[PDB]
C-alpha cells in the first residue's frame, strides 16, 4: 500500500472534454486499467455512460487539467459468483428499451468479469463491436437477459501486433491489439488510433 | 430496462 509515482488505476477522476474547439464540458469517471504495450493509455468508464473508452489521459491535448478525486470506488463484493461464472464467454440476448418503450434486443457476448467495479461486467455486441460495461446481474435478475447454450498450451495470443483494414474514404483503420480474453482466446481487444473506443474482435 | 441512449456521450 504505497508507490513512488502515479498508479491511479482504480481511483476515480474528474476532467473536462473539449471537442475540436467547442465547449469544455466536465466529466468524471473511473480509471479501470492500463495497457502495458504502450503505457501512455488508460481505460475509463464514465458515470452515466455504460461504455468504456481508451484515452491517453496525459499525452493528449484534448483532455483538460487532470484532477484525481478522493472519492473511493467501493469494491462492494458481489453476493454470489456462481451465476457470474455461468455466463462468462457465452452468447446472450441483451434486451434494450427504446425511449418510446418499444422492445429491441441485441445478440452479444459476455466477455468476462470487469476490473475495479466487480458487479459490472464486460460485454461486446455483434452489429455494434465495442467494449461496454453493464451490471448484467440486474439484467438477468429482472428478466432482460437470456443465455443460448453451447491440450498443452501453444503460443496462442498475438497482443502487440499492429493491424490494418480497408474502408471507404480512402482510409484504413490503423491500430494494435492489446488483450487476449480469458474465456475465448480467439477474440482480442484492439485500439485504433484517431479513435477513442475499444473494439472487441474475433481474428480466427 | 436499460437504454441505448445512455450508451455513450
Author numbering:
A (entry chain A): 46 to 195, 206 to 259
B (entry chain B): 1 to 9
The authors write:
Spindlin1 is a member of Spin/Ssty family and was initially identified as an abundant maternal factor in mouse oocytes and embryos at early developmental stages. Here we show that Spindlin1 also acts as a potent reader of histone H3 “K4me3-K9me3/2” bivalent methylation pattern. Structural studies revealed concurrent recognition of H3K4me3 and H3K9me3/2 by aromatic pockets 2 and 1 of Spindlin1, respectively.
H3 residues Ala-1 to Lys-9 were modeled in the complex structure. Consistently, the H3K4me3 and H3K9me2 marks are positioned into the aromatic cages of the second and the first Tudor domains of Spindlin1. We measured a root mean square deviation (r.m.s.d.) of 0.458 Å between the two superimposed complexes. In the Spindlin1-H3 “K4me3-K9me2” complex, the buried surface area is 231 Å2 for the H3K9me2 mark. By contrast, to ensure proper registration of H3K9me3/2 into pocket 1, the H3 peptide takes on a more crouched conformation with an induced α-helix in the middle and the H3K9me3/2 mark is inserted into aromatic cage from the side.
